[PDB]
Amino acid sequence: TTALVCDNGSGLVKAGFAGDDAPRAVFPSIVGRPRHQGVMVGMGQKDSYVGDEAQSKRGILTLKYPIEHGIITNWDDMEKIWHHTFYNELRVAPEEHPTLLTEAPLNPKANREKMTQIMFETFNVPAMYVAIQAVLSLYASGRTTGIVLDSGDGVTHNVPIYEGYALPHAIMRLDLAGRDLTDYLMKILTERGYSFVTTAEREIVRDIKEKLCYVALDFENEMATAASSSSLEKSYELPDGQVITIGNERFRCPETLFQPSFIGMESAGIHETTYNSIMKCDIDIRKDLYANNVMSGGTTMYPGIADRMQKEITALAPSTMKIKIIAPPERKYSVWIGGSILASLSTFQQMWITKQEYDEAGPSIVHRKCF
Amino acid sequence: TTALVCDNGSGLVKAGFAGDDAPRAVFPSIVGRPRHQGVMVGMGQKDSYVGDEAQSKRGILTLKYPIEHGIITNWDDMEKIWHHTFYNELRVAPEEHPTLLTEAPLNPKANREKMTQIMFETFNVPAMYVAIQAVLSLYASGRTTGIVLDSGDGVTHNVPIYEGYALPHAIMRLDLAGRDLTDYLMKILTERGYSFVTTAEREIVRDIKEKLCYVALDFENEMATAASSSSLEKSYELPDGQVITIGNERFRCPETLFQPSFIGMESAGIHETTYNSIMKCDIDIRKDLYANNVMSGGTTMYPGIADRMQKEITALAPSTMKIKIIAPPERKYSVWIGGSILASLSTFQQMWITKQEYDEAGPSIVH
Amino acid sequence: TTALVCDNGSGLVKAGFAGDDAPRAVFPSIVGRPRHQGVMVGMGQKDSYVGDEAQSKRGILTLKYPIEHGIITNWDDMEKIWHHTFYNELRVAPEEHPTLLTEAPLNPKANREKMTQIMFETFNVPAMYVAIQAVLSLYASGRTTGIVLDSGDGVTHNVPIYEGYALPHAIMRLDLAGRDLTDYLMKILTERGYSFVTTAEREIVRDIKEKLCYVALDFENEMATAASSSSLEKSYELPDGQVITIGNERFRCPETLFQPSFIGMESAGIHETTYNSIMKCDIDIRKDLYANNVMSGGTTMYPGIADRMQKEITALAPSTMKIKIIAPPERKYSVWIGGSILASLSTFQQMWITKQEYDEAGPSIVHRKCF
Numbered sequence A, C: 001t002t003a004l005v006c007d008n009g010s011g012l013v014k015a016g017f018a019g020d021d022a023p024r025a026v027f028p029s030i031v032g033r034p035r036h037q038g039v040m041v042g043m044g045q046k047d048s049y050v051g052d053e054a055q056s057k058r059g060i061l062t063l064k065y066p067i068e069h070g071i072i073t074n075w076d077d078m079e080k081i082w083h084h085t086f087y088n089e090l091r092v093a094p095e096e097h098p099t100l101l102t103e104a105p106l107n108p109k110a111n112r113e114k115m116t117q118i119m120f121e122t123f124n125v126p127a128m129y130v131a132i133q134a135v136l137s138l139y140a141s142g143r144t145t146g147i148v149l150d151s152g153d154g155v156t157h158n159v160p161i162y163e164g165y166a167l168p169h170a171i172m173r174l175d176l177a178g179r180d181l182t183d184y185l186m187k188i189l190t191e192r193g194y195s196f197v198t199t200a201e202r203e204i205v206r207d208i209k210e211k212l213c214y215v216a217l218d219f220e221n222e223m224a225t226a227a228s229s230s231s232l233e234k235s236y237e238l239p240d241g242q243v244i245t246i247g248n249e250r251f252r253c254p255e256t257l258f259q260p261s262f263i264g265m266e267s268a269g270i271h272e273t274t275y276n277s278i279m280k281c282d283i284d285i286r287k288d289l290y291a292n293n294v295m296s297g298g299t300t301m302y303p304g305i306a307d308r309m310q311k312e313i314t315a316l317a318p319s320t321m322k323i324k325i326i327a328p329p330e331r332k333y334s335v336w337i338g339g340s341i342l343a344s345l346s347t348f349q350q351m352w353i354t355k356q357e358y359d360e361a362g363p364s365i366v367h368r369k370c371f
Numbered sequence B: 001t002t003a004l005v006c007d008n009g010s011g012l013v014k015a016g017f018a019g020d021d022a023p024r025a026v027f028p029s030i031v032g033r034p035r036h037q038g039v040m041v042g043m044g045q046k047d048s049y050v051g052d053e054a055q056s057k058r059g060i061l062t063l064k065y066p067i068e069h070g071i072i073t074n075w076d077d078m079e080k081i082w083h084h085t086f087y088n089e090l091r092v093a094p095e096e097h098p099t100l101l102t103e104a105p106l107n108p109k110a111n112r113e114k115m116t117q118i119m120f121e122t123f124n125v126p127a128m129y130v131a132i133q134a135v136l137s138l139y140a141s142g143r144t145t146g147i148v149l150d151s152g153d154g155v156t157h158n159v160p161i162y163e164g165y166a167l168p169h170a171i172m173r174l175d176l177a178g179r180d181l182t183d184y185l186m187k188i189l190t191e192r193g194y195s196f197v198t199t200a201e202r203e204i205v206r207d208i209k210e211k212l213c214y215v216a217l218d219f220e221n222e223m224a225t226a227a228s229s230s231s232l233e234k235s236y237e238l239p240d241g242q243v244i245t246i247g248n249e250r251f252r253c254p255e256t257l258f259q260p261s262f263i264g265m266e267s268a269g270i271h272e273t274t275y276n277s278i279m280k281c282d283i284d285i286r287k288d289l290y291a292n293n294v295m296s297g298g299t300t301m302y303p304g305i306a307d308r309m310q311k312e313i314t315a316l317a318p319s320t321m322k323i324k325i326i327a328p329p330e331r332k333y334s335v336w337i338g339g340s341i342l343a344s345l346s347t348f349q350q351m352w353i354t355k356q357e358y359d360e361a362g363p364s365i366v367h
């Protein structure tokens, strides 16, 4: 009847119907299992919890993310998450509507192939399609030219597009993302005597990072100000009532996005990666790419990230270039919105891989490019 | 036919049938034997007395508690007490019904094993099960989350439970209990010239403690008030008609629960133990445990104990926490009530260790 | 004149002079105070006891460890222990020689800063330096490449080093150590009817653990053998003359090192932690790290721990890898020996933080990396 749009990013599922302005179902991509003792199957004791229900009882659970660095590693947990999305969150039969899924570029083929297998075997989905997230972000933005930097929980990637034409050879991928920043914050908080070792404490640290961290315009100046003043400190209340205080850490955790060497990686920063991706393109393309820099994803939601982005790109690029960072207030859902647009186009209706095609052709048809 | 629920705590047996709101049989766990001369076996002279019958004739008897600090030490006396419970108090064949017994955590394995041996050898019980008392107290309370402090005559223990899931690594046990308080009161009463040396006099002192003692909100203020006034004194009549007067002792005996150093123990108080047990749990569990503190047992029946409990826990915990002490009027029987609930659940019927299982597997199946 | 080397680990002080093969002063890091009654200040009644003197009279004392999980919590007791080390055990003025102290990685900054404050204020030490223990262990071992697992009373940590170059981003820390094992043994001994509640009884249980415990090669097989035989039981005589008998507990207490869930911790075992730390390193580093596994500390002194270590690491690693566990007979003092080597190098003489530097720069200079 109506197409389903589902952005299953690392640690977050956003699912809804095509034509809507926002998905109904937004929940963490986690599976929690009891910790301290075996499950009493005789009583009404559950052996697993999914999403917000797992978050509510995380104090006695071990939490796992089935998607890691954009690649699904535990397929049973992925099946359970999909089942809960379809029958518990969206109140819809999967066998009633076609599905549009999202994936990061430069992923292993088997990941997509097995995903299709599930979507056609466990669930009797009529038709399905998998799209790249950055293309959907540019679709949501409303332009046909631009270079998209999409950063989530597991994967950061840069994709340029000119006049609606893809540039596959300039796509760049980096494994630094929000989960690495959360781990780095857990490491750094031990300097003030705060210990977080478990997965629930990891969720607490992720909340702290989302609520207090920000990007500094100049790292050295901000470090000097934090060392010579107390105006940078902020307080946070723990679930048990204890209060912690945080200082320069607020701008040291996201600084890893521009200096990956903080966590021991040889790669360059996001600004350098964007500049290098632009310098791949033909000399007649670079100016429009400079004028159109598009951000999407949760990891781009740090305050001040756009200003630092534009400053760094202006430093790298010649002085005669227009440089614009486009950071909409609704970056987090941008990809989903793009899907909701793409599934609503009548010109997209040829993209649907029907069950005749999957059965006759096999898994390889998931790598087709109809266009 | 109908399950039997029996809470055999140190110095008190509470036995009844499952589904009832209270046990029929509540009596002391004592065995009394004649003191001054050998028993005239020729005449109708009994050589031993059990329970209330021993209490009635305690003036010529030496009294013994077969259970000490939650561990059975005299098995013949335990057998006699069980026999009197089954054939004299409850008027029921043990070989007719299954049995649910209670035990304190962190007890020696052999204690349970031998108990099972008795319940399957001397008495031909069809099936039996042993449960932890704090879990039964939480079952009686009606909640699924909370930390239970159970204190009786020999053992005090703290057990937290969250969403029905046990937390075995946070269980705490302390040997200070009502018997130690009775001994401390016997020691302290010598300051006013009152001497109690025998076991019957120990029972008298236990009655005095149960009838006059209470917990002070502030120990220093109460001591100052007692020293500067006579409004704290109370009178008590002895069995022979003599009258004694008691003062600050009324709140000094239970104060040992919060200051064990009064009796030479290095451990911390019950409030500190509860706080430490809570600080073991995961940071996402502690708030619900703060909101649910459950008391059970006779030693928690002192007036004002809940107020001092909440005040101390509020002092230790952060200011943003909800702290509640739940002290029902029927704490003394709470454990038993929990058993009466647990034995009545159809989901519990898989727990019964039948005689096939005990005979085929051996003692280890009790664990 | 001659540098002083002092390894003040949780519950044990090992102090001596640089250039020696072993410290003179080895004694517990405890402070004991009278229990049952107030101290008669009129008579010659002491109010506190330190080290072996506290151990001799522990029957009437309450004992405290000023260092807990590698972090100093009672600074007055630490000051008293340092004073007794300097003026009673080593017969040396602190204001005569420079000092080299040891610390675990990922500790709070304030701990080190206050330590320096004491070493420069209460004692007029000319110069001082704080070093990581695992680096000193590798220095003592004599190699330049290897991954060190150091486990003591409060902290276990893994540090890899390649060609003398540090790898700070692969350092791992765990709070499970010998004190937790002693507490677990105290818990487990109640199954046989043995009760130990006080601190002196804790010392007795620690002696029992040091004297009778061992690591089993296969836990399930050893449990089956102990259940089906009496050859595993051992006897121990208490100070009052009573004799206790111990069975499978001998190998159940150290098994917590490989299965932390025995005490309710979500973390992995020491073998899994070592494997994960190795899998951080670059693919060109891992083989040498496999060939060089170095153990140090008291908690690594259990018989059979090296065999279980090598078996587990062989199980985790590929079959083509050389895997070696290096467990010298003198692991307990290894860190100290490393210090005695490091303080004797002429190239180390630039490391000394002199009083000019501390006074002019302040506490922050304790975090400097001269190198």
Ligand SMILES: Nc1ncnc2c1ncn2[C@@H]1O[C@H](COP(=O)(O)OP(=O)(O)O)[C@@H](O)[C@H]1O
Pocket (backbone or CB within 6 Å): A008, A009, A010, A011, A012, A013, A151, A152, A153, A154, A178, A179, A206, A209, A210, A211, A297, A298, A299, A300, A301, A302, A332
């Ligand atoms: N306001 C915020 N500031 C900083 N980081 C955020 C914020 N909101 C979300 N994040 C981070 O974004 C990451 C993933 O978000 P998102 O990209 O929306 O989902 P997914 O990665 O599953 O596609 C999370 O790890 C989270 O920590």
Ligand SMILES: Nc1ncnc2c1ncn2[C@@H]1O[C@H](COP(=O)(O)OP(=O)(O)O)[C@@H](O)[C@H]1O
Pocket (backbone or CB within 6 Å): B008, B009, B010, B011, B012, B013, B151, B152, B153, B154, B178, B179, B206, B209, B210, B211, B297, B298, B299, B300, B301, B302, B332
């Ligand atoms: N009203 C009371 N006030 C103070 N203590 C009491 C009171 N009633 C009973 N006790 C004490 O409780 C102790 C044991 O009671 P209980 O816990 O019910 O039985 P058991 O310990 O055998 O399980 C006795 O030593 C008794 O002194």
Ligand SMILES: Nc1ncnc2c1ncn2[C@@H]1O[C@H](COP(=O)(O)OP(=O)(O)O)[C@@H](O)[C@H]1O
Pocket (backbone or CB within 6 Å): C008, C009, C010, C011, C012, C013, C151, C152, C153, C154, C178, C179, C206, C209, C210, C211, C297, C298, C299, C300, C301, C302, C332
């Ligand atoms: N032979 C042994 N077997 C098992 N454990 C030991 C042995 N010797 C010492 N230990 C343990 O090592 C722990 C600390 O020793 P060590 O690491 O040398 O000192 P520190 O931890 O203070 O640096 C103690 O808790 C002790 O129980």
Ligand SMILES: [Mg+2]
Pocket (backbone or CB within 6 Å): A009, A151, A152, A153, A297, A298, A335
């Ligand atoms: Mg995303």
Ligand SMILES: [Mg+2]
Pocket (backbone or CB within 6 Å): B009, B151, B152, B153, B297, B298, B335
């Ligand atoms: Mg009781």
Ligand SMILES: [Mg+2]
Pocket (backbone or CB within 6 Å): C009, C151, C152, C153, C297, C298, C335
């Ligand atoms: Mg050590």
